[PDB]
Design an enzyme around this catalytic site. Structure first.
Site: not given
Ligand SMILES: *[C@@H]1O[C@H](CO)[C@@H](O[C@@H]2O[C@H](CO)[C@@H](O[C@@H]3O[C@H](CO[C@H]4O[C@H](CO)[C@@H](O)[C@H](O[C@H]5O[C@H](CO)[C@@H](O)[C@H](O)[C@@H]5O[C@H]5O[C@H](CO)[C@@H](O)[C@H](O)[C@@H]5O)[C@@H]4O)[C@@H](O)[C@H](O[C@H]4O[C@H](CO)[C@@H](O)[C@H](O)[C@@H]4O[C@H]4O[C@H](CO)[C@@H](O)[C@H](O)[C@@H]4O)[C@@H]3O)[C@H](O)[C@H]2NC(C)=O)[C@H](O)[C@H]1NC(C)=O
Ligand SMILES: O=C(Cc1ccc(Cl)c(Cl)c1)N1CCc2cccc(Cc3ccc(F)cc3)c2C1
Ligand SMILES: [Ca+2]
Ligand SMILES: [Ca+2]
Ligand SMILES: [Zn+2]
Ligand SMILES: [Cl-]
Ligand code: NA
Ligand code: NA
Length: 807
Positions: A159, A691
């Site tokens: 879910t 990638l």
């Molecule tokens: C699916 O779609 C998504 C979205 O488009 C694609 O994901 C993107 O991929 C990009 C490349 O991998 C990536 O770009 C990087 O961004 C870094 C900044 O990141 C932060 O800010 C963004 C923007 O707001 C934010 O979204 C990020 O969120 C991630 O991390 C937080 C936790 O901190 C999580 O809450 C969130 O869930 C998300 O996690 C996911 O992504 C991260 C990677 O960012 C993974 O580690 C997780 O496991 C998870 O999958 C961030 O908060 C930026 O800093 C990067 O830059 C580095 O690399 C470049 C290369 O161009 C280099 O030039 C730079 O020097 C830099 O390197 C430096 O740091 C390195 C590591 O410490 C180090 O080794 C070097 O030596 C350098 O010092 C990079 O540009 C982008 O963030 C993600 N976005 C998301 C939302 O995931 C995805 O690829 C698609 N998938 C497919 C299969 O196509």
């Molecule tokens: O509302 C709920 C029950 C719920 C009750 C209490 C808490 Cl405390 C939370 Cl965390 C959730 N749920 C189910 C889980 C869930 C997870 C991620 C996102 C959502 C929102 C959502 C709704 C519709 C849609 F099309 C896409 C996303 C949802 C929607």
């Molecule tokens: Ca479900």
């Molecule tokens: Ca790769």
């Molecule tokens: Zn179920």
């Protein structure tokens, strides 16, 4: 602390969430134990139930009532949903004939059609047909609107990962909600369905639709609903919000139902007890639609009816226990059920070894109902590895089964409760779910092919005039769902242009350690071979244009009689190799005298070539060919297939797979599909991010050389959708299937690999089926650049997954 002594008077289901210690009146206050003292009294009224009756029509307003049937209710926005039907002679929406909604018919002051997402938990795709007699409102949405026969969820088919994917357009590995249960080792914190850690925003990555809207000046209703708020009250709250003044009224709303999932777990997907929950969901849809009709919004709002995943038959007796395989079961932590994730119980135990656990779980019992994987070896189509919250050891569980650590976990949690579960591989038919879109922006009476739920975020953004945050959808691939608001993308620009080398090196300049018995020699046929090397057959073998290289690199186009390639000077092998095999093509053998033949390519420098000596010295690594010698058009053309520029590194165990694909399966597909075009190549994804790796990310080379070892090999197999036309003379839409095969030094994944390849290779390839778009990400290439087809149609083709499931 909460000071619950504040009041919800005039604040019921307020949109802005107030901060502690101040008490809350929003739709999640119950979940946080934070509602003001009078929330139930004021906000959860139930008096007199949910429906007007004839005796209540024109009543004097009583503000205690759950909803109203008084004359003033329409202007207050709080009539019971059946008011106009009971009191003003109107029909239920469901009883009205479908009439096309050509344009939005919205009240004054509506800036855009609102979007209402109606999400149903556990709503299996086949319920639409199987339950259609008891779901008349849903059936009307489906038949009159735009529907798919099913919608594919993301893995795991649970879910929280799926609803958050719907909201973000992101794979779980990227949004971070990788299961309903998780451990994050950086946080040293656990996320669970029960409890309070899940409220912390650090779990929830990407940018969900409600945030996208808000950031762009579009107001959003809250998408979450505390479980104890009854569905009737959820609908009346949405309808009340829709009556807000223009400056205050949201444009996007979500409803969530815990059914039919809740009952499906107890009764199985088709238990007799399932009829009633389906009836009740339908009634709720009818309430919403009658409600919208009362507000004159029924031909203004776009409604999406969508599920998170399906439901399979699963019982306690179909559980595999890790205690029957591992000696060390107390040294591991298992996330159990319809998938498995294993990690060390203690990070202080240095005798924990993932290799020994994997081996103890591999092909140990003849009917074993799970398969262990290091996460990087999971099918790439699952996109389930690039997150620290995903444990290194994964178990893919067969449909209908569970995995658990020890029997006591199953009967001390000794009889069985449940009959349904979900979470399995997202290609499994029972996990598929539903999509219907109804409204002015959707098409009328239109069936669309199945698609993935990662695509919907983009469309929902399009429905609201929003720019989507970066996501994993392919924006444009769902344009065929929409009457208007289509997104018209441009093809990405080619970053690197190819070189077209002619003959530049003499044979004796090469010292590659290769040999070939080819010293065998006419002006008719001499001009002819020259023409083939300049591209005279390229129109036959490169049917959809050359792929575009979307990153900076150095590469050469090489032409041949039977195939064309894009050869990387940096990786010393083709990025891609393209060839067409007609229905009439003949398979031949590799002649005896050519068995170990590798020939220098006089168009490509020795310095940018592979060498045979590296393969001789690497006792683990052998080589294969991208264009298969077996499919040469003539004995003389076959020599081209042994060019060093068509060679790629292959483990002997993989060569078994590859040889069978090339010698048997390609010709089989050409016979079945009336010719095929094949593009094959290497993939390097050492950091399992989905990638293309740069050169400096390559972890393994052919011993002593700079020849990089691929992690995977792909093929894209394209033909005419109208199979009465041959692949190479196709006037209309295309048909594709693709795979991304892991390049592994053993066949441990395939438990029957000691048998003939006819009993296991094709099964392997089906497991590793892929979208063209998956290959694009992994290679930096852009395919189908030169077709007759619309770009949006090509985008849909690129997102197609051939699933190999029956109906
Ligand atoms: C699916 O779609 C998504 C979205 O488009 C694609 O994901 C993107 O991929 C990009 C490349 O991998 C990536 O770009 C990087 O961004 C870094 C900044 O990141 C932060 O800010 C963004 C923007 O707001 C934010 O979204 C990020 O969120 C991630 O991390 C937080 C936790 O901190 C999580 O809450 C969130 O869930 C998300 O996690 C996911 O992504 C991260 C990677 O960012 C993974 O580690 C997780 O496991 C998870 O999958 C961030 O908060 C930026 O800093 C990067 O830059 C580095 O690399 C470049 C290369 O161009 C280099 O030039 C730079 O020097 C830099 O390197 C430096 O740091 C390195 C590591 O410490 C180090 O080794 C070097 O030596 C350098 O010092 C990079 O540009 C982008 O963030 C993600 N976005 C998301 C939302 O995931 C995805 O690829 C698609 N998938 C497919 C299969 O196509
Ligand atoms: O509302 C709920 C029950 C719920 C009750 C209490 C808490 Cl405390 C939370 Cl965390 C959730 N749920 C189910 C889980 C869930 C997870 C991620 C996102 C959502 C929102 C959502 C709704 C519709 C849609 F099309 C896409 C996303 C949802 C929607
Ligand atoms: Ca479900
Ligand atoms: Ca790769
Ligand atoms: Zn179920
Ligand atoms: Cl409370
Ligand atoms: Na070797
Ligand atoms: Na095997």
């Amino acid at each position: 602390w909460t000071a619950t002594s504040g009041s919800c008077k005039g604040r019921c289901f307020e949109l802005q969430e107030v901060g502690p210690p101040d008490c809350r009146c929003d739709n999640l206050c119950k979940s946080y134990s934070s509602c003001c003292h009078d929330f139930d009294e004021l906000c959860l009224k139930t008096a007199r139930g949910w429906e007007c009756t004839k005796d209540r029509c024109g009543e004097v307003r009583n503000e205690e009532n759950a909803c109203h049937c008084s004359e003033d209710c329409l202007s207050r926005g709080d009539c019971c949903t059946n008011y106009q039907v009971v009191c003003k002679g109107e029909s239920h929406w469901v009883d009205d004939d479908c009439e096309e909604i050509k344009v939005p018919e919205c009240p004054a002051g509506f800036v855009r059609p609102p979007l209402i997402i109606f999400s149903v938990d556990g709503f299996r795709a086949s319920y639409m047909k199987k339950g259609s007699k008891v779901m008349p409102n849903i059936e009307k949405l489906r038949s009159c609107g735009t529907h798919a026969p099913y919608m594919r969820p993301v893995y795991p088919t649970k879910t929280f990962p799926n609803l958050y994917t719907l909201a973000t357009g992101l794979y779980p590995e990227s949004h971070g909600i990788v299961g309903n249960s998780m451990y994050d080792p950086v946080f040293d914190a656990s996320f669970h369905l029960r409890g309070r850690e899940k409220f912390n925003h650090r779990w929830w990555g990407g940018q969900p639709l409600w945030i996208t809207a808000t950031k762009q000046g579009v107001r959003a209703g809250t998408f979450f609903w505390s479980v104890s708020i009854p569905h009737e009250r959820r609908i009346l709250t949405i309808l009340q919000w829709l009556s807000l003044p223009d400056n205050e009224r949201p444009s996007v709303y979500a409803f969530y139902s815990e059914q039919p999932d809740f009952s499906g777990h107890k009764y199985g997907p088709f238990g007799p007890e399932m009829t009633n929950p389906l009836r009740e969901i339908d009634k709720t849809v009818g309430q919403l639609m009658d409600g919208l009709k009362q507000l004159r919004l029924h031909r203004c709002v776009n409604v999406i009816f969508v599920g998170d995943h399906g439901m399979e038959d699963v019982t306690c007796d179909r559980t595999e226990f890790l205690s029957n395989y591992l000696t060390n079961v107390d040294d591991i932590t298992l996330v159990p059920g319809t998938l498995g994730r294993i990690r060390a119980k203690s990070i202080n135990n240095s005798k924990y070894d993932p290799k020994t656990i994997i081996a103890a779980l591999t092909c140990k019992k003849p009917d074993q109902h799970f398969k262990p994987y290091m996460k990087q070896h999971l099918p790439k189509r699952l996109h389930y590895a690039n997150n620290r919250r995903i444990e290194d050891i994964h178990l893919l569980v067969d449909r209908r089964w569970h995995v658990a650590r020890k029997p006591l976990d199953v009967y001390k949690k000794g009889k069985c409760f449940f009959q349904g579960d979900h979470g399995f591989d997202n290609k499994v038919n029972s996990m598929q779910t539903v999509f219907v879109g109804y409204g002015p922006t959707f098409k009328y009476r239109t069936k669309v092919p199945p698609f993935e739920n990662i695509e919907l975020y983009n469309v929902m953004c399009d429905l609201l005039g929003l720019k989507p945050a970066p996501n994993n959808g392919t924006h444009g691939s769902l344009n065929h769902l929409l009457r208007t608001n289509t997104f018209r993308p441009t093809m990405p620009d080619e970053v690197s242009r190819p070189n077209y080398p002619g003959i530049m090196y003499l044979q004796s300049e090469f010292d590659l350690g290769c040999t070939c018995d080819d010293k065998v020699e006419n002006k008719l046929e001499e001009l002819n071979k020259r023409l083939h090397t300049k591209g005279s057959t390229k129109e036959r073998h490169l049917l959809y244009g050359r792929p575009a290289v979307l990153y900076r690199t150095s590469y050469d186009i090489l032409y041949h009689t039977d195939f064309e390639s894009g050869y990387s000077e940096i990786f010393l092998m083709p990025l891609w190799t393209s060839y067409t095999i007609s229905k009439q093509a003949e398979v031949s053998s590799i002649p005896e005298h050519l068995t170990n033949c590798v020939r220098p390519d006089v168009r490509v420098s020795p310095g940018f070539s592979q060498n045979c000596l590296a393969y001789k010295n690497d006792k683990q690594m052998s080589y294969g060919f991208l264009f298969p010698p077996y499919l040469s058009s003539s004995p003389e053309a076959k020599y081209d297939a042994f060019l060093v520029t068509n060679m790629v590194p292959m483990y002997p165990a993989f060569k078994r797979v590859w040889a069978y694909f090339q010698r048997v399966l390609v010709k089989k597909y050409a016979s079945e599909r009336n010719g095929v075009n094949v593009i094959s190549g290497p993939i390097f994804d050492y950091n399992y991010d989905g990638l293309r790796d740069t050169e400096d990310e390559i972890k393994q080379y052919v011993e002593g050389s700079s020849i990089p070892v691929p992690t995977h090999y792909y093929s894209i197999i394209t033909s005419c959708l109208d199979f009465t036309q041959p692949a190479d003379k196709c006037d209309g839409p295309l048909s594709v299937s693709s795979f991304i095969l892991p390049h592994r030094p053993d066949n441990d994944e395939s438990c029957n690999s000691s048998e003939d390849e006819s009993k296991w290779v094709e099964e392997l390839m089906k497991m590793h089926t892929a979208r063209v778009r998956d290959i694009e990400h992994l290679t930096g290439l852009d395919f189908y650049r030169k077709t007759s087809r619309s770009y949006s149609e090509i985008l849909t083709l690129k997102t197609y997954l051939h699933t190999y499931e029956s109906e």
